Amino acid sequence: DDDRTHPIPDLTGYITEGQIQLSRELHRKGIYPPIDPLPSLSRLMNNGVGKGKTREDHKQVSDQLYSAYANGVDIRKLVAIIGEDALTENDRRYLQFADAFERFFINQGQQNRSIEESLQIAWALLSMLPQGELKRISKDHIGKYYGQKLEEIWGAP
Amino acid sequence: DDDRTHPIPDLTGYITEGQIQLSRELHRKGIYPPIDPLPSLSRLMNNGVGKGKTREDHKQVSDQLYSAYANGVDIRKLVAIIGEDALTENDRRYLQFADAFERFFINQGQQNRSIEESLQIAWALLSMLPQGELKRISKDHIGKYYGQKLEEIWG
Amino acid sequence: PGGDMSEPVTQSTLRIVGAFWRLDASLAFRRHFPAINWNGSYSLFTSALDPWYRENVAEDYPELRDAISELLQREAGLQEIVQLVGPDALQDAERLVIEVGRIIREDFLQQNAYHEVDAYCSMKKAYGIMKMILAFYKEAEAAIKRGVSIDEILQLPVLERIGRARYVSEEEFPAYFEEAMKEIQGAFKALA
Amino acid sequence: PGGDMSEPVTQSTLRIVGAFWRLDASLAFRRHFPAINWNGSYSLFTSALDPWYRENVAEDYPELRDAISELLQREAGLQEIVQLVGPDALQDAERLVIEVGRIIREDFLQQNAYHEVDAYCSMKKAYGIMKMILAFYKEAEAAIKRGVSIDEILQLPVLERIGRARYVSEEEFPAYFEEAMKEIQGAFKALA
Amino acid sequence: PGGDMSEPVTQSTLRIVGAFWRLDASLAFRRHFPAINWNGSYSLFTSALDPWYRENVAEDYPELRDAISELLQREAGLQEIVQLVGPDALQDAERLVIEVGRIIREDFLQQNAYHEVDAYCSMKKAYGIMKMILAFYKEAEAAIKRGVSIDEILQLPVLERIGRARYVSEEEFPAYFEEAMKEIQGAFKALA
Amino acid sequence: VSPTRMNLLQRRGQLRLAQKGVDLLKKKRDALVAEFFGLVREAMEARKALDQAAKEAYAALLLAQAFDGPEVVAGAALGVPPLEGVEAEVENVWGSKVPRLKATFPDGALLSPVGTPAYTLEASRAFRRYAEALIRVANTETRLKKIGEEIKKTT
Amino acid sequence: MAVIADPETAQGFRLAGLEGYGASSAEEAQSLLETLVERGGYALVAVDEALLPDPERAVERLMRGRDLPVLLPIAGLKEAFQGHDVEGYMRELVRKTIGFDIKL
């Protein structure tokens, strides 16, 4: 009954190493797959990322995406009361980041994306945020990957 | 403990063809009989009413009364949060309709009303609402019965 | 028993059926029928029937259905704020969503099984009603950004034209639809 | 057990008894004894005792009792408003209703079982107390129309006369009653 | 199971244990380690341990610990100020205690277990750091009644002496402590 | 409330909604405080400009009253027509409607085309500029009051 | 608009076309102010700060449901030639509004 305290979900969390939670609201909006990044968690993630495997900027990019999406989600609810004109510039950029994130990153459809393509799209989405607000990423990676436009996936969603 | 989900009322509702449910809140206000219209139901109502049996406008008037009373009861919950002075002009009409409905239609005492007098009172209560908001009533009956003022019956 | 959906029979049936049509007592109290709970219902045959719908109804019918579902989801999202601060605290762009959701709920979803005409509805009539509702919503959304207050829009006579399209007979619907689509454009160009 | 009124012993008892005197822990905490909840209690013998009341105490006793019950109901209705909107938001009539309800609650309903005089109360003494309270309410609602501020009415010395009335002995009560019936009119006549 | 300490095991544990170190993930989100909620934690061994503390650590250790706890408590009582009014708008006497609370939270209640010398801290070192912080606080307060710009106090070089006291080695700490003891006095006498 | 599992889940959903509403109202209060702390600065600047206007207008009036004589000053006062050129148009702020004071202030409709009195005309000019600053002070202060009331209502 | 002040400088206000009045003390001030709140037409009233620091609460019994006439205090002669703490006045506004008395 969507009850996370039910015994089958309860005892599974005591033996397993995280969970991936599908969202009904994302499914009703037409987004596939409806994977909601906020309550999902992988506990062994830090052991399989970092230099020597995948790419060296994986963990910081993931943390930055999580924080920015968390900000944009509540800015989206604040807009419905106080109006869009009452926001600052940064809040509007966060709102647009959340919209573009849900439009392009989560909603991949039936595409088979490699890790490099996913990281490229992630860095393209972070480029919409201004430089210097990316607190969780060091300057070395920002000076190497920041700046690419979204046109690679924007031209064909 | 006024519980509708108790097994005895639950199975009685599953077996029988409707129910008449009394309300304690209406009893505390002094209204007799304290029949609560929203939880009440009659399954065989469609067989015994209509043209050639009681009158041609019975069912639509009943439906419109149900919808308007539900809207008034819903507005009563918004008033407890925002206060009745912050309402719009439209919602105050529904609130006053609900109050007049409870004080005049349900409350009748020991008198024996006929069906025609009950329909006359119901049409007098519907006249306080705008003519364009009677969505569930056809215009033929609206052009025939609308406009009667409640003070003509109790005055 | 008592409307408890955690019953063993209800839970066992949930795991094998393809469609689930949950009913609500609160909608039946206010005489809103068929009283299907939109939030708790689902269907798993939607994606497989699209090749039939495209050939037999219209090419853009699934897009209209998805747009209607998106509007209903957005309206369901806003209702948590309406309970918190009242309906008047919302902006006009959100009040438009609320009123369009109310129009959809009271016109498209509601159906009378004992009425002489409304008891049966073909697919093309529902498609026409959906098209009319979406055209009205698009015109109203365009009108708000131009500067018209929402209190002007929801008093137009075309609301009664939309709201009583249920009772139009099947053989008379194509003329009514073509009149209403012209009336929408005729009414929405005179605001500002 | 634990003040739960849904346990089987209470429910089996309520189906046969003709009177139900419900007690409240909230009134017992604030030392408002006898702590009878006047909203949840009921009695089914009220209508059959009226001919006895009309012969043995007064012909207008049921009307006075109904007026007091109506005042208590209005006071309970306003108590939902005052707590979260603020007592100052009420108009003069509503503040007067609140204060008269407080006077009724503290001066008439309350009774001390250990006092040498207040432990027993006759019917005519209670009848005089209701007459005093309703005469005061009528005079106050008449004087509000003259523009007098409410807090000036709460500073009237006749309030203490009503407050100390229940401590007067049974033999001395009729002399006190006439003096109150003169002072209530006199104070409000001299009051602006 | 969900952070609720109302489960049976937690009550059964709380009844018998002498200490209770409540952790919190909110301080881990800010990467403040050890992430111990100092408002919900408690210990019952403090009263019986100070005859050891004031004989083997320092005579002023207990009173210094209570002063540090009072300083921590005073910062927590100003949260309903900062969550409404902006932090920079506060008075000097309140901005000072907010800054000293931040200094406590970042330079005393924070520890690195992977560092060469910061992983283990002795009682003499901790006593020296607490004396250093209180020597800063008293002189800043006295300068506040003397009357200076608060921003100049927040810029003085003794802040580096406060922060860098963690990473000094155990055997070379006392020289650093004496140097900082003379340095804070020399710096605050140099201030106007 | 009948104790069932579905009702328990419904109550927990309501608790979640209440917590999220509390957080959202906190954010709204933050925005209102952000507006208020700048509106107060603008109002302070307007008040301290009005003070200088008062200084110079009072100096001009005091000097003109003695040198020229109160008789001719009064005669000019009856000579000057009275003005009611203020229209209370209403401004919308944060879901509420507040009045905004707009002054007509016509030129050339007044008497004394040339300064036949020596110093009365300058005093008239100074007091007219005084009124022109006073309307601004009132305009900012009423908005400050309404924003404060909204802050109190939210908290 | 209307404005009440010392009788020495009401002539300055009628010199600019305003409806200036002169008041000698607090009782004359509040009676006259009630006279300006009873009739309609004027949208703003100014009162000497040294006479009545609270021009709205002194009449608040009469406009519990309307707010068209703006009531506002202004500095008189005694403040104009030597200055007064407008910063203290605005701190007092913050006092009544927020309730915390914080500012730097």
Does a cis peptide bond (omega within 30 degrees of 0) precede residue C157?
no
Quick check: do G and C touch, 3+ CB pairs under 8 A?
no
Does a cis peptide bond (omega within 30 degrees of 0) precede residue B33?
yes
Q: What share of chain D is helix, strand, coil (3-state, %, to 5)?
A: 60, 5, 35
Strand pairing report for C19-20 and D19-20: unpaired
Q: Which of C94, C122, C103 minimizes the C-alpha distance to C161?
A: C103
Cβ contacts of E93 on chain G, cutoff 8 Å:
none
User: With helix as H, strand as E and coil as C, how does D39-66 read?
Assistant: CCCEECCCCCCHHHHHHHCCCCHHHHHH
Phi, psi of D169 (to 5 degrees): -65, 165
Q: How far is B29 from chain D (nearest CA, A)?
A: 8
d(CA D53, CA D33) in angstroms, rounded, equals: 26
Cβ contacts of F95 on chain C, cutoff 8 Å:
88-89
Written as one letter, the residue type at B26 is L
d(CA G90, CA G96) in angstroms, rounded, equals: 10
Number of neighbouring beta carbons within 10 Å of residue C5: 14
d(CA G61, CA E5) in angstroms, rounded, equals: 53
Q: Does G50 touch chain F (CB under 8 A)?
A: no
Terminal Cα-to-Cα distance of chain E (whole angstroms):
57
Phi, psi of C183 (to 5 degrees): -65, -35
Token pair listed for B55: 């009158």
Q: What share of chain F is helix, strand, coil (3-state, %, to 5)?
A: 70, 10, 20
Written as one letter, the residue type at E99 is E
d(CA D122, CA D116) in angstroms, rounded, equals: 14
In terms of phi and psi (left: phi > 0; alpha: psi -120 to 50; beta: otherwise), the region of A95 is alpha
d(CA E104, CA E119) in angstroms, rounded, equals: 18
Q: Does F34 touch chain C (CB under 8 A)?
A: no
Q: Does F44 touch chain E (CB under 8 A)?
A: no
Chain B: list its partners (3+ Cβ pairs within 8 Å).
C, D, F
B92-123 residues labelled b (16+ CB within 10 A) or e (exposed):
ebbbebbeebbeebbeeeeeeeeeeeebbbbb
Contact B22, B34 (CB under 8 A): yes
Q: DSSP letters of A44-81?
A: TGGGS-STTSS-TTHHHHHHHHHHHHHHHHHHHHHHHH
Q: What is the resolution of this structure in A?
A: 2.8
**Bridge partner list, B50:** B55
Name residues whose C-beta falls within 8 Å of residue A28's C-beta, 6 or more positions apart in sequence.
C69, C70, C73
Quick check: do E and D touch, 3+ CB pairs under 8 A?
no
Question: Helix, strand, or coil here: G48?
Answer: strand
Which of E81, E88, E92 shows the shortest C-beta gap to G100? Answer: E81
D159 membership: H or E segment, kind and range: helix D158-163
The answer to whether the CB atoms of E89 and F37 lie below 8 A apart is yes
d(CA A40, CA A18) in angstroms, rounded, equals: 7
d(CA A20, CA C149) in angstroms, rounded, equals: 44
Cβ contacts of C3 on chain F, cutoff 8 Å:
6
C-beta contacts of C180-184 below 8 A and 24+ residues apart:
C180/C132, C181/C131, C181/C132, C181/C135, C183/C158, C184/C132, C184/C135, C184/C136, C184/C139, C184/C158
- Report the Cα D152 to chain-centroid distance in Å: 22
Contact D165, D176 (CB under 8 A): yes
Chain F: list its partners (3+ Cβ pairs within 8 Å).
A, B, C, E, G
Phi, psi of A122 (to 5 degrees): -65, -40
Q: How far is B71 from chain C (nearest CA, A)?
A: 9
Token pair listed for E113: 């277990």
Say how many CA atoms lie within 13 Å of F79 toward its Cβ.
16
Token pair listed for E45: 């061994």
d(CA C29, CA B70) in angstroms, rounded, equals: 8
- Report the Cα G27 to chain-centroid distance in Å: 14
A105-124 residues labelled b (16+ CB within 10 A) or e (exposed):
bbbbeeeeeeeeeebbbbbb
Listed in sequence order, the DSSP H helices in chain B are 7-15, 24-28, 45-48, 58-82, 89-101, 115-126, 139-145
The answer to whether the CB atoms of B10 and C2 lie below 8 A apart is yes
d(CA D43, CA D20) in angstroms, rounded, equals: 6
E152 membership: H or E segment, kind and range: helix E150-153
- Report the Cα B121 to chain-centroid distance in Å: 11
Written as one letter, the residue type at F133 is A
The answer to whether the CB atoms of B1 and D85 lie below 8 A apart is no
Q: Which of D110, D108, D90, D84 minimizes the C-alpha distance to D30?
A: D110
Sign of CA dihedral B52, B54, B60, B61: positive
Instruction: Give the domain range for residue D94.
Output: 44-191
Name residues whose C-beta falls within 8 Å of residue E56's C-beta, 6 or more positions apart in sequence.
E123
Strand pairing report for A18-19 and A41-42: antiparallel
d(CA B64, CA C18) in angstroms, rounded, equals: 36
Name residues whose C-beta falls within 8 Å of residue F35's C-beta, 6 or more positions apart in sequence.
F147
Q: How far is F141 from chain B (nearest CA, A)?
A: 25
This structure was determined by: cryo-EM
F110-131 residues labelled b (16+ CB within 10 A) or e (exposed):
beeeeeebebbbbbbebbbebb
d(CA G5, CA G32) in angstroms, rounded, equals: 11
Instruction: Provide the number of structural domains found in chain G.
Output: 1
Token pair listed for C135: 């055209």
Q: Does B113 touch chain F (CB under 8 A)?
A: no
E20 membership: H or E segment, kind and range: strand E19-20
Contact A124, A95 (CB under 8 A): no
Token pair listed for B105: 């239609």
Q: What angle do CA F49, F50, F54 make, to 5 degrees?
A: 120
Token pair listed for E166: 């963690």
